[PDB]
Amino acid sequence: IESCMVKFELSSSKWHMTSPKPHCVNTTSDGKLKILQSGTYLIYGQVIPVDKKYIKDNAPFVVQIYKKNDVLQTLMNDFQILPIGGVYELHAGDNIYLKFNSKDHIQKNNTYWGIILMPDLPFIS
């Protein structure tokens, strides 16, 4: 029943949390997390790219969400605002993290991500 949500701010590398020690997730200062409670989660976030005029490298703008050692979601566009995630069934022990093609692509200010343990949605209408 306990509400459980965390939000990692890339600007500060700090997690903002529902409680001092969220029951559903362990978080680390590298922006990674580990699911502690099996259940239905929203994985969410926005990856903000730098203006293309600043990009030095030849790499395309790609964001991957990993679950354990496998890719959960792959996202790409022409260096535009990039909401991430969706509703997933996760299990205790599942590590979740993001991988970027190039860290130089990412505007740290206002880039964030996280999860929320979702309540059941029993009522249809």
Add this chain to the structure above:
Amino acid sequence: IESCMVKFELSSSKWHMTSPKPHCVNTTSDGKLKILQSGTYLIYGQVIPVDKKYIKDNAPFVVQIYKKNDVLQTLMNDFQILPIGGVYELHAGDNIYLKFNSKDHIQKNNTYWGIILMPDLPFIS
């Protein structure tokens, strides 16, 4: 306190909800929302496009989320699965809804969207 989360499934045009009559929003059968409680919301979803190979013109795949008459975000990609949304401060009275560049671009099955009234995140680590 009581969680408040709703999820619209485009396949069925049904909302799935945390409670019989959520306190934080009203919903419409067309997949629109009206915010009843001012607060911080997570807007989320995935918009599934029809395969590129079946779109025989140059019309782009674009999704916009609106708050009343204001564009909250504009998203586009090359006809790939499209996560939407993010954290937004909303106010009582705000209407939230999606608009598509072409309704014909949208696959109903597995397309969904919704909102969550977020818990406060006072603790930082």
